[PDB]
Amino acid sequence: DPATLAAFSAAFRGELIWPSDADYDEARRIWNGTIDRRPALIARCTSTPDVVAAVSFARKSGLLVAVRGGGHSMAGHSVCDGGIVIDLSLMNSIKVSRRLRRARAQGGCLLGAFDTATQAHMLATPAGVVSHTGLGGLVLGGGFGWLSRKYGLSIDNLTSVEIVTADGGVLTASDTENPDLFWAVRGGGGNFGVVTAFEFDLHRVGPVRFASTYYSLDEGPQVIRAWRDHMATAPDELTWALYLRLAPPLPELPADMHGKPVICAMSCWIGDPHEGERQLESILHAGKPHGLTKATLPYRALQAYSFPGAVVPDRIYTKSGYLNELSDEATDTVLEHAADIASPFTQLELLYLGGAVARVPDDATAYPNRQSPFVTNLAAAWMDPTEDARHTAWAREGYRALAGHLSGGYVNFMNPGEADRTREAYGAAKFERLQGVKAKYDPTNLFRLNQNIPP
């Protein structure tokens, strides 16, 4: 309808990428490569006007909007099948203040670009763990990493946003402005508009003592029991996480471990590094550490470490869910399907959150399950588009085989066929509450390609 297309390009200094321009089959590809979808319009917005135009445009056309910052939607929400892609990867500017300990970042940032500007001043705020993950879809779901047990979720450090809502208007959501919207972006997602800016508190993070070993699966059941036990009685500065996987062919690992399911235990001490080598070594030798690696490295080097760059996988499938305990038998059943790992890319991720996250009132952010400390995540990953079921089944037949021991679920780990879990994840009180926020701000559900909340 060239009536709309007419004055869009009038107010659009960015770039449009049609299904004919050469760079289309590469701009419609996202990080989860099981997603062969074909949009009809790519907008690489470059400023807030570029977003308001596209959102006004995409309204005045009725196009299924897929918004996109980093592309790491483990459900494929960042590319639509025939709509418009409001792409923000070039909204990537950052302002950092050494003395205000304030940061300010556009919505298309990657974590690495954010951790590189703040660490120029020996600063940081908690965010994800892999650097090319986008800052948008992560922060709009809560977002956790190594700083989270000490400094909380990313939403706990967010002071204000700038958001472009469905009607084509630009707001400012803080605690003194649209606190309803601010309550809902912090854990809701795109549902309520496109966020063109964030503002974070920062924290002085210097070097950290980091260690990562690869215990053997046979000694597994006690380590998981050591890990489960010790993190319930652990200080906020101890961040420990277990990843079950095939041992990479790395020269610090014996060849008689290469390819066989091991336990990768990655730990860091967010404080004085000498209390690091004390508090770390008290937990390092619960099993027999193999492939050992310790270092006193800066935070920005810790965020770029994960994971061990064997490769970046093309095809992934994840099944997540929160936990409250870890029954002795589930511990036996995660070790049951660790010896069934098919590819060296799938990980069975056991993370103990809690810390400064759990010390936050539930009804303070739209993020659910703060009082849940354990987060499990059967993340499959593979290369062969014809081995799709063997890996996808290992997640299903492992998610299910303990789905009674699970509560809720992280929205940012959801798979494509999983919109049915938005109530189960958020809970009836957060959902019912997020309903009337969408009703006010997204009264038409203009932003529907997410873990959606209908008004």
State the binding site for FAD: 67, 69-73, 78, 107, 129, 134, 137-138, 144, 195, 410, 412, 449
Shortest approach of Br ion to residue 85 CB, angstroms?
10
Q: Which does 166 bind (CB under 5 to 8 A by kind): Br ion, ligand FAD, none?
A: none
Nearer to ligand FAD, 46 or 78 (CB): 78
Query: Measured from the CB of residue 67, what is the shortest distance to Br ion in angstroms?
Result: 12
Residue 216's binding partner out of ligand FAD, Br ion, none, with CB under 5 to 8 Å set by partner kind: none
Q: Closer CB to ligand FAD, residue 244 or residue 286?
A: 244
* Secondary structure E strands in 114-157: none
Please name the amino acid found at residue 443.
Answer: P
CB of 57 to ligand FAD, least distance (A): 16
Distance CA 40, CA 76 (A): 16
User: Residue 80 touches which of ligand FAD, Br ion, none (CB < 5 to 8 A by kind)?
Assistant: Br ion
Name the minimum Å distance from CB 206 to Br ion.
27
Which whole-number Å values give the CA distances from 73 to 54, 127, 141, 239, 350, in the listed order?
A: 21, 16, 11, 25, 20
Q: Are strands 42-44 and 65-68 parallel, antiparallel or unpaired?
A: unpaired
Q: Which does 81 bind (CB under 5 to 8 A by kind): Br ion, ligand FAD, none?
A: Br ion
The closest of 353, 343, 360, 356 to 376, measured between CA atoms, is 353
What does DSSP assign to residue 338?
T
Instruction: Please give the residue ranges that form the binding site for Br ion (CB under 5 A).
Output: 80-81
Residue 195, contacted partner among Br ion, ligand FAD, none, CB below 5-8 A by kind: ligand FAD
Query: Are 85 and 38 contacting, i.e. CB atoms less than 8 angstroms apart?
Result: no
* CA 134 – CA 30 distance, rounded (Å): 12
Binding site for ligand FAD (CB under 6 A): 30-31, 67-74, 77-78, 88, 107, 128-130, 133-134, 136-138, 140-145, 189-190, 194-195, 412, 450
Binding region: 67, 69-73, 78, 107, 129, 134, 137-138, 144, 195, 410, 412, 449
Give the count of beta carbons closer than 10 Å to the beta carbon of residue 440.
15
Compare residues 91 and 247 and give the one whose CB is closer to ligand FAD. 91
Residues in the chain: 455
CA distance 225 to 222: 5
Query: Which of Br ion, ligand FAD, none has residue 73 at its interface (CB below 5 to 8 Å by kind)?
Result: ligand FAD
Is the Cβ of residue 79 or residue 406 nearer to ligand FAD in the bound state? 79
The rounded distance, in Å, linking the Cα atoms of 252 and 449 is 43
Q: At its nearest, how many Å lie between ligand FAD and the CB of residue 271? A: 20
Q: Are strands 158-164 and 194-201 parallel, antiparallel or unpaired?
A: antiparallel
Residues contacting 367, CB < 8 A, separation 6+: 141, 142, 153, 155, 186, 187
